[model samples]
Target: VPMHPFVKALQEHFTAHQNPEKAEPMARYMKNHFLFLGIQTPERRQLLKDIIQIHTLPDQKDFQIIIRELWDLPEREFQAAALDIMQKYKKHINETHIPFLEELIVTKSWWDSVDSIVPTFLGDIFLKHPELISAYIPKWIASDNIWLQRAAILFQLKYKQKMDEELLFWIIGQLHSSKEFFIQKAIGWVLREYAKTNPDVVWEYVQNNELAPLSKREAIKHIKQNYGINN
Candidate 1:
């Protein structure tokens, strides 16, 4: 497959600045699950800033193609670059792009990558087309893939007052019995985020449910900090 011009441009800079010292520890942090260029976030973002600003991304069809090419790369930062492009062009996203985003979530799955894609990329899509929720989110929840399940729970992280309370609770109900660390943490993380908007609701829900200790602790983390209420 031919490289996307923008991706190729960024890769040129990324390869030139390889740092094994930084790369080793960075790989260790992710348990060596993925290769790293050892490029830090600020530097990576700076390097790609020009491409995003100056280059015209292809139409949605080619945009999807380019992202997949970036995903196929071995290093973790390439996925980060893909996400950076996704975020920059998010307003252009429509219902047709949902499958591509879903594929990205489950492919090469990890919290570092999946979490960033979920709240921002998927969240942007769902918010723009509220109609897609009933069609897509349920499938994500029902899937055996934990990453997709995590995405389903977390796509609402940025919704705040616009969050669908019934949907949030319903998804959690489906996954609350889950023992997956990512799922459990997502439950607490979502609840904790929602707590900022509606503390009492989150508090009551946390108290009533049999959430894992990690979930329970994180769900109530901010509530306790601000309101001095302990679960």
Candidate 2:
């Protein structure tokens, strides 16, 4: 299928703004798992604002089409733009989009895409539909796909005070033994974010958990910074 005009323009916009000089380094930074147009985030986001108006066209309403159209493209910016559209239509999101979200979560399967989509869009949708958690979270953590496992650990980032501590801890316990950089880093990041609300509890959890050294370091970064305590 041919790309929609919106998507066509989206691609054209990114290509027009493409910087050959930076693309290689950007791709290198992502471990070469995906390609880049060499457009820096600040500049690319500004161009995205210039090009995307998905709501104006009726066909644009199906976000799945927009995302799928861009999904196969070589540049990571396309997925990043897809995320922006998803956020714009987040209110219309519901249980119907879970499969689509899961598909995308594991598709490119990298920190940049998974981390953004899981924390913001997935987190928002999850709050409105708690049932998705029970069905998907367990499957994700138990899977060999590290991105899904990272998503399992990170989708709660925005929940803050409302986060399920038991679920979070359980997921950590399940993956704490892994040497994967992404999982350990996500564990640390999530714990560090959670610590802002309940420092002592997070600190205690860190002490009790058999986390990788990286996880422990990332988890306690905020705690140590603010409290000046190492225990």
Candidate 3:
């Protein structure tokens, strides 16, 4: 498809909308905005919903401009733009572009923007060529890159029934000794989400593992409520 005029001009639009005073705060708030925004799986579905006015003429120039413009943003804004693009044309995202998605996951810094991509866009990418993922996920999990490791942890988050419980455990096990708040919290939150499918299993996993107070608390908060158990 050709680039739309609106996509060609996204940089100008984003620059005009960028709030210098709110950049840092916005970064923190927006990365995990789905939690506050009340949607997490297809994390950026709302961004697309909110930006329904952009006109994509299906020109490559416009699409390139849009992608470049998003790449230039601070992580949060970049993520918002990427999510908008993916949700806008999920069916159009080709297999050749998986590397483009991978670049973003490994770039500038790893946070929700990058993390969210793992499940929504990357998961979609993997579904098309499962071997690309099968060949790479293990390498990704073993990478020294924090972002890659986090990506490994979150990529399967929304697989639902097709999720890999063992891989989830593997990701957590790899990070078991790290005390990074983000790592601790991520493990917990991901487990908490998975717990919905099998709370007893989650509890057993939690009981058997050595987890930080924060991870344990965040992961089991609802489980406690579900079973009426006081922590």
Candidate 4:
């Protein structure tokens, strides 16, 4: 079988970086898939395109199982392989897998797992399928599950230059009163990230709402570093 060029390239990178000796030690620390590849945002995304280009058409179930299996690999051994898998498979993902991915994010049952993975992969998928996501995002915001609510809010964190300010405010509006620490943190986090684009806007918004102390503090985390001591 012809391997995907991106997968093949990533596999080569993984092989070069592989270290069986530290597998146990590596397993003790690393957890999320993205971190394992030491890639984030745009660069991380490039790999996804490469994978899609190489494969053209992948069996979704096969790709998903491979992705899930990557999580099980000793974090130290051929770790780039895992990143390659994520890069290759993330974009081609279908709507059917959202529930399963949701299950994984909620697996460790807290911010650690949800915070790390929720904002990127699954979040990207929801945005891709807005009709499906629309049904769930608001529902998530209203859920008893705080992590799900956080996922709903943080999915747009990577929108960067393409961010829709109005939509962002709309989403934040949904979680404004959320009492959960995780949801509060995500609200502030999205604001902090968006602040790079407009600090004044974030400040105005934070002040307009009586966000939880924890949230207000986190929202200005980036700017508070000055003599302002603003956080």
Candidate 5:
């Protein structure tokens, strides 16, 4: 895991602050895979802010290179940094970025990292260049990887009022029978987020669709709290 000098500055800063005390306890409790720096979120974001400021900016051409390089490192913080770096460059997202994003989604493949990339990077790209939607969404949902399916579901989390209800429901239908906890959870999560804008529609869908109990609960959580409608 050699660092890009660009990311090397990050390596030095983050490495200097490693906390095995926090890292081991985090690892011990987490359902457990991947190592951590035990850097707090604010602390890690502070490192990212500093590293981005002091380092020479990477060319858009090297965007994926920096991402790929960071992702290969053992520490989960690097991957988180990789995600932070990518989101900071929303302008760099384009049709070509998809393969690399898809790569990242399936690689370390967990909720924390993939969830960030999905709603921001993936959602932003899809909105800007909708043609790519036809290119990737079906492929992602159909893939054997649970993370890919979760990405497809979660990509629209930020869309809110602009979200496509039909498509959201269809994607849910696409993944309806999946037994994966991540898939079911994303279904509920996405639906719940969408429910903020249109609770009635979400309630309708939750009532009509046969979803995992977890999915159904999350989908209706807001509705239950706000409207006292326990469907």
Candidate 6:
């Protein structure tokens, strides 16, 4: 794939440092769908720090093309690099970027990339433009794509006290019966995170709903830690 200039530079840097040994294990961990450079996270981020400082982030016009190019790369780290670039320019993304994000969600789809892209990039976009939630989340929830559905369930993972209880439950209501491990985990994970701020609400929601054991277990993980109660 022809990489954007910045992506080309990143590719060059990672190519020089590629570790075949590490790559084998990393690929196995992700089920071997995409190749890896074998560069660990800290080293990868360290390499990126210099690149980000030296190069100005691409303008909005270039952002779309660059992200797609990054996703097209065969290596897994490129997706992470794409996410890093997106995070740096997150504030620049507006409602106009929602389609692009949805595109990203379904392409090169996996928990590793989609999970990061949604809560950090997509969630930030939705928080900035609250109207997009009403407009976009329903479509995601209704989709057959588990990645998009996971994104819908998890975009609020970090919302804490600012979390919308009504919308969270509503999204879960659509996904609660899922047998997919990721979806069930997301249901519990979001509830677990929210439980920190409002244990009672999470407790009540879990109690009333017919959640999978995984969902119920994770939802109360922190609650049990803090409150010392088993459900």
Give the Cα RMSD of candidate 2: 2.1
Which segments of candidate 2 are over 4 A away from where they belong? 53-60, 225-231
lDDT (C-alpha, whole model) for all candidates: 0.87, 0.84, 0.66, 0.64, 0.86, 0.87
TM-score, one value per model: 0.91, 0.92, 0.74, 0.62, 0.92, 0.92
Candidate 1 is scored at a TM of: 0.91
**Which of the two candidates, 3 or 5, achieves a greater lDDT against the reference?**
5
Clashes of 5: 0
- Name the regions of candidate 3 deviating beyond 4 angstroms: 1-8, 17-24, 27-55, 60-65, 73-79, 127-130, 227-231
Q: Write the per-residue lDDT of candidate 2 for residues 28-105, one digit (tens) a residue.
A: 999998889998878877887787554253243666788888887889888888777777777678777888889998
Candidate 4 lDDT at 90 equals 69
**Model 1 stretches with alpha carbons more than 4 Å out:** 50-61, 225-231
Give the alpha carbon lDDT tens digit for every residue of 1-231 in model 6: 555788888788878888999999999999988899999888888888877677766677788788889899999998988887787776688778788889999999899998888887788777778777988888888999999999999898888877989999999999999999999999998999899889999998988888999999999987876657655
lDDT tens per residue, model 5, 77-182? 8898888888767776777778878889889878888888899888988877876787888998888899999988999999987898888899999997888999
Residue 38's lDDT within candidate 1 is: 95
Clashing pairs in 6: none
lDDT of 4 at 88: 54
Residue-wise lDDT of candidate 4 within 103-189, one digit each (tens)? 666544445456556767776776677668676777777777888878877888887766667777887887778777677888888
Q: Please tell me which model should have the higher TM-score, number 1 or number 3.
A: 1
Model 4 clash pairs are 48-87
What TM value does model 4 have? 0.62
| Model 3 lDDT per residue over 56-151, tens place | 334543454566555555445555665667665666776677767777777655575676677788877766676676677778767777777777
